[PDB]
Amino acid sequence: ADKELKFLVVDDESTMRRIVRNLLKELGFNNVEEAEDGVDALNKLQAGGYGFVISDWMMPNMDGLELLKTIRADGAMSALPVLMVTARAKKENIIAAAQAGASGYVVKPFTAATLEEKLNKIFEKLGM
Ligand code: BEF
Numbered sequence: 001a002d003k004e005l006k007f008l009v010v011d012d013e014s015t016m017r018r019i020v021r022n023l024l025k026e027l028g029f030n031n032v033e034e035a036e037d038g039v040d041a042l043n044k045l046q047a048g049g050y051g052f053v054i055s056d057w058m059m060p061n062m063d064g065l066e067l068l069k070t071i072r073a074d075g076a077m078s079a080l081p082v083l084m085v086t087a088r089a090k091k092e093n094i095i096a097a098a099q100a101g102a103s104g105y106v107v108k109p110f111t112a113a114t115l116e117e118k119l120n121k122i123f124e125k126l127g128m
């Protein structure tokens with residue numbers, strides 16, 4: 001994928017956003033911004049320019065399932081790639097997110113290899 005792709009990394013834990021941003025940097029992506037919840041994320045997204053979202057689920061203000069649904073319903077954002085990266089592990093959770101339009105789903109804790117693999121899986125699917 002284009003190394004100028006602009007990422008939005010969303011999680012209410014600074015430590016997890018830091019993991020994800022440093023992983024992206026290793027993969028060659030430096031155009032990366034952070035958001036602390038679904039509302040914060042939508043503000044950044046409405047500001048424009050974003051090509052990929054990586055999002056947690058459990059967050060105050062607006063959770064990641066609601067954030068995914070909001071993105072998928074919005075005509076200006078509807079095809080935006082959204083990778084869920086979450087501790088939510090039940091099959092029912094994966095189903096709700098997949099059916100809501102998740103591009104991919106990674107369960108915490110995850111390895112560097114898993115993130116790279118699942119990001120590349122989305123790039124291939126979308127022809128990026
Ligand atoms: F708080 Be997240 F869904 F890992």
Ligand SMILES: [Mn+2]
Nearest residue numbers: 012056058059
């Ligand atoms: Mn969380």
